[PDB]
């Protein structure tokens with residue numbers, strides 16, 4: 001029930017309070033996304049950033065939110081170190097939670113944990 005523009009403000013506050021530099025510049029903002037898919041993305045954006053704050057030990061977090069072809073794509077990257085096991089998608093927790101909720105919406109969640117942690121989340125639009 002959170003607009004994505006409002007969630008952006010929440011994550012700026014959370015990252016600043018955690019002494020993590022937030023890097024965001026508006027580019028290709030979605031011109032129309034369903035209120036459902038927008039709200040799913042707000043929830044996933046919040047969780048991606050909760051994870052940065054709780055686990056990463058990052059000094060920087062970069063967020064991109066772009067309409068690309070038939071998807072809205074959100075990427076959240078940080079320059080800390082990934083703390084999870086080889087398979088970090090477990091029942092009852094946010095990575096698998098976000099992936100399952102996105103996939104139900106015919107979207108996707110990918111993760112790269114080489115240079116810190118980067119989450120790419122996409123949903124139809």
Ligand SMILES: Nc1ncnc2c1ncn2[C@@H]1O[C@H](COP(=O)(O)OP(=O)(O)OP(=O)(O)O)[C@@H](O)[C@H]1O
Nearest residue numbers: 051052055056081082083084088092093094095117
């Ligand atoms: N940005 C990150 N940086 C470092 N480690 C991370 C990051 N995101 C996730 N992890 C690791 O992946 C694990 C699983 O993440 P997940 O969000 O599924 O669970 P959680 O945050 O521990 O619990 P919950 O999401 O239920 O509050 C984390 O416990 C942590 O070890």
Ligand SMILES: [Mg+2]
Nearest residue numbers: 051093094095
């Ligand atoms: Mg989590």
